[PDB]
Amino acid sequence: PARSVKDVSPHDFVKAYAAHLKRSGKLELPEWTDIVKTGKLKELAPYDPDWYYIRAASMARKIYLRGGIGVGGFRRIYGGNQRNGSRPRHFCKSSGSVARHILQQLQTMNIIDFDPKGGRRITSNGQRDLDQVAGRISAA
Amino acid sequence: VESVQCFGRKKTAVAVTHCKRGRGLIKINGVPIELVQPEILRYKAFEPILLLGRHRFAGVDMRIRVKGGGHTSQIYAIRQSIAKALVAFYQKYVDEQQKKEIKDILIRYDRTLLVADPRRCEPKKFGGRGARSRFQKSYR
Amino acid sequence: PHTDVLLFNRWSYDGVQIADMSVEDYITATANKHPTYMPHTAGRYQAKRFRKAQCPIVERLTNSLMMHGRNNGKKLMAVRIIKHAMEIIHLLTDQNPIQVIVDAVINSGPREDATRRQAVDISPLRRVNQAIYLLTTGARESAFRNIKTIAECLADELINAAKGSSNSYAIKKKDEIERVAKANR
Amino acid sequence: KEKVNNMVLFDKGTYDKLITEAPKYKLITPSVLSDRLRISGSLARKAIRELMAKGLIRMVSAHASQQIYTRATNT
Amino acid sequence: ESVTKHAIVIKIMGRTGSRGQVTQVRVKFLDDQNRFIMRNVKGPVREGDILTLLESEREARRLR
Amino acid sequence: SLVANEEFQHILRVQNTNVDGKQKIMFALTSIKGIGRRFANIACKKADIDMNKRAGELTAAELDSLMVVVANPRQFKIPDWFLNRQKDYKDGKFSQVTSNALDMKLRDDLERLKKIRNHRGLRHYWGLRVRGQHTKTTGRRG
Amino acid sequence: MIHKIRITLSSKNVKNLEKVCADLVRGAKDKRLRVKGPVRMPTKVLNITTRKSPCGEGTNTWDRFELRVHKRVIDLFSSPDVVKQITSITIEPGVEVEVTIAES
Amino acid sequence: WNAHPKNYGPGSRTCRVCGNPHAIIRKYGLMCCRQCFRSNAKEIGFIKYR
RNA sequence: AGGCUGAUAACCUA
RNA sequence: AUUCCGUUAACGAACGAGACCUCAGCCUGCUAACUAGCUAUGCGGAGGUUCCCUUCGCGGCCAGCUUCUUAGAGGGACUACGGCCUUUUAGGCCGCGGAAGUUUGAGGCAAUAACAGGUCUGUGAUGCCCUUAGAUGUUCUGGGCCGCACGCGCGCUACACUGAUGUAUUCAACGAGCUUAUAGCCUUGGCCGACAGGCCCGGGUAAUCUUUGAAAUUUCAUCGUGAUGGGGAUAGAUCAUUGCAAUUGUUGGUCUUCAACGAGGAAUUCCUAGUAAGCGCGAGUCAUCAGCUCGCGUUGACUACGUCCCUGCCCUUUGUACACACC
RNA sequence: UUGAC
Ligand SMILES: [K+]
Ligand SMILES: [K+]
Ligand SMILES: [K+]
Ligand SMILES: [K+]
Ligand SMILES: [K+]
Ligand SMILES: [K+]
Ligand SMILES: [K+]
Ligand SMILES: [Mg+2]
Ligand SMILES: [Mg+2]
Ligand SMILES: [Mg+2]
Ligand SMILES: [Mg+2]
Ligand SMILES: [Mg+2]
Ligand SMILES: [Mg+2]
Ligand SMILES: [Mg+2]
Ligand SMILES: [Mg+2]
Ligand SMILES: [Mg+2]
Ligand SMILES: [Mg+2]
Ligand SMILES: [Mg+2]
Ligand SMILES: [Mg+2]
Ligand SMILES: [Mg+2]
Ligand SMILES: [Zn+2]
């Protein structure tokens, strides 16, 4: 067979493609990578030192699967439950600066572009890049 | 065009399996069924294949679309749509006696493989937070 | 008889026997009585009396793990716990984990009780219900505020109960129930 | 109710006990080692990885919540 | 001394006890199938199912 | 995994506080007043300290570099919004105040309000709630 | 020459709405016009839930009030003048007819 | 006289039927108090089914 | 002081 | 079920119950959809080996079609069928088949006679009484309704490892939405910002746009039985938003502070299946404010299939010095 | 006699 993104486990793919983005050296991490949290719903900053590449790999896989997602859509996708002390939990959005910065980097890498109807769309080069990485993952 | 389209239901989940003459492909929304999530419910979705055997599916291609419901109910809807689609395919394009044989196997194992569960959520009534549950009563 | 259905696709129902006349018809763990690949069926077992005796014994154990309130309805976690516990049981005992589970249920079911107080006999169905309740109550209590995981506690509870050892929480409670019953004869 | 005092790092005496006795256990989990060797669960998780690297124990089940290991060779 | 025996339920006499929590049944001993007695049973029981009697000498009074 | 060497310490002393040596360094620093989990984590990153090791494994030099970060956050580019004393009332400066300096700062805040007979200062003096909470039914501990 | 004209019908009364829809489709089939519909939009259920008591005493009972709106859409391929002729027929009470030239 | 702003809040809105300011139903633009609405519900077109 | 009682006494708990 | 069969000095009727109406459950049958889709086909992108295969995007009022969606009309269950039990009865138990075999589930409606039950503070419903210009009318400014030794009721969050945290991953339903004034409602997309929030271009008076629309859960890692990374009260500093106005913190952020609480005495509530419980969402209120209420779905059990012991209710017989009726 | 107990 010939595996593409849909044919491989999402967990395995994101790890492999994140190591691919870091290895290329094309993403320019912002100054505040080590300081920020990924939303006000969080208590602490991410544990993984390479969380930025992991998030960028995850966002590329979602644009590959569905076009037209904007920054607001990604804030919802990585949002979740916020705890409010002695009050009930409610849904909260995640950081827009993290989403916007990652999208603007993947676009300079030519993995995504502007969808005419709004949001971001995977490019032909982006499709090849993601599909080639998925093909190299060992069968597991 | 020897194809059938059978649905399965569980609560608000609806899965429709498009079963056509093929070579044995089985995919859910473009993803191979071997990657069904969650992984512990993967056994439930594979029961029709395990019960009948892969050799019964060698001459068909099943593409499944599922919507609504939740993680558990979508598996049961998918599980039901696959069984119904194969039975509808054998009746229409293979034989009546072969349809008789496989349907007996599916029924002897579990009747919900072919017959939907009619249970739905009971509406909430005022004076309590559930359908039955009432607000706590105090006297003094 | 023989069946191709394996629990979790790991454990065989062949060779599993219920060596107790009273509760044989109320434990569903053999190859002839509807073997199941997984202990998760959206069954309707409360529609009628004695209908839950057809529910597989492994799934009846899984349901009793969805306590207390914090764990209500978290059946995917419960199925995982029993899946891990059976793996642990196989390592420690070198026996079929399904066979060990039925032995634990048979040994931990009280056969006499007190009511009103005088001694009365317990029906085979309630005996199975009590055994399941006692086994999961002991595992839950030993896991609480303990480094030991719930799966390891459940495996040890079942291994001791299947052996008949007093180390089991369910064996001690069964003795206490039958000790008070004899005092009120 | 007394408080456990689980060591966060091995000492020469306990580390040698791990390399000799632990490979012989039928069931090896972080909580089994944590209780037998009086080590914290965090140290037990790292210790199990070392035993895996040395090839002294084989894996039976892997789950984020429950990890199950056993002696590589029986008896 | 008490000897454990197994007996099969023949007929359901009726629910007894203050709150109806007990059932009186007629049981036939399996070892000797010509002996019948009445027993009080806690929990759901139906005709046909088998019981374990820790002591078989006692007998329950009708409508106890 | 690794064996502890003789340099391992079970108790440390930082800014007149007892720091447990068996705790992960990130959570060992939180025992200092004015340093929470968010600030302890950023301090270890700016000091290039491996957060995977225990506080007792750190050398004396490494432990000191942590307190240099805490004392000069702006020098290490920790932003102003991340500090527990932003735009001080007297000096207007931004800083992270810890241990007794934090206790002195809290004392000066309440004394200032009480001195001008501010409403919030008076409720601090009377031992009442100051953040608009109803007091009819809760907070009954006297 | 031939244009897709959209007719929208709304009403609270289903029988009256279905009666007018049949009169229009059947009235257009007589002229041999191409007809698309009627298309039934999902029913809009306006809902007001209110306390029965005019005061606050007694068991707190609630009245659930519902006002259902049914909507039909019929597309006729013909000229505006012909459509104006078909729709000009007297319409049943409470049925709101709305003729627009589909923007396509 | 009447100088205080009345652009928002209960004081700005009143029942269209009776003029009372309490328990106004603003949904769908009804602008009736809950008591007047129940009296006039049938005439407005609202009905009880379940 | 709380609980039990429509309420009081009795009773039960702290 | 005062539901029926029968009995019978009654006969024949009227209400309530049932019927009924709404929602839900079955229909590969009917009607028919560019504001809902599917299948096929054409073109294009990517992967694998030019055909071919896998996957995604776009197009076609002359591809076809209605399985999935919507909503009209109908059909479908009657305990029909089998066994047994009951009086020839009325009916009941078990079972096949069946979407469904508790009046299939859940509601709405709902008799006679009552209560000195609640409401004059919903009403341009209202009698009498009071007040009516140093007003109990009305409006304006400010404060109060929230004030805190204490007692009680409905709740929310917890005491952790069946967990918290950080990743990765991923599936609902009910519903609601604007005066267009630069723009007053729901808001996509782009940009700026760590967050909170701001700017710009727009869509939608709506199966068309928001809506590509949740959480618990799943998954990997860290933590390791320590009031601990459990818990988040109390409190300091500071930033932003709503408003004419935020102090007695409106609310929302950031760092810091880090209380009780280790499962709860006597007592006591609710609940029999998609129910309990857990999990979040919409709506009402609303400039701003939800720990509340009314609905919605998601995950999904234990136990019982009884009894009149407790608390009550219905019918019959019976006792009564009670009729304001055993308070 | 009817109710209530
Ligand atoms: K998320
Ligand atoms: K107080
Ligand atoms: K292609
Ligand atoms: K009134
Ligand atoms: K009056
Ligand atoms: K009012
Ligand atoms: K706090
Ligand atoms: Mg600190
Ligand atoms: Mg206040
Ligand atoms: Mg259809
Ligand atoms: Mg119908
Ligand atoms: Mg009545
Ligand atoms: Mg009165
Ligand atoms: Mg008040
Ligand atoms: Mg209430
Ligand atoms: Mg916490
Ligand atoms: Mg979705
Ligand atoms: Mg703490
Ligand atoms: Mg307010
Ligand atoms: Mg309220
Ligand atoms: Zn009004």
Numbering used by the authors:
A (entry chain K): 3 to 142
B (entry chain H): 8 to 147
C (entry chain E): 23 to 138, 147 to 215
D (entry chain P): 34 to 108
E (entry chain M): 2 to 65
F (entry chain J): 2 to 143
G (entry chain L): 20 to 123
H (entry chain N): 7 to 56
Quoted from the paper:
Ribosomes are fundamental to all forms of life on earth. Their activity is regulated via chemical modifications of the four rRNA species: 25S, 18S, 5.8S, and 5S. Here, we report the structure of a plant cytosolic ribosome and a quantitative mass spectrometry analysis of its rRNAs. The overall structure of a plant ribosome is generally conserved relative to its eukaryotic counterparts, including in regions that are responsible for the binding of mRNA and tRNAs.
In the large subunit, most human-specific modifications are concentrated at the bottom, in proximity to the two largest ESs—ES3 and ES6. By contrast, in the small subunit, both plant- and human-specific modifications are scattered all over its surface.
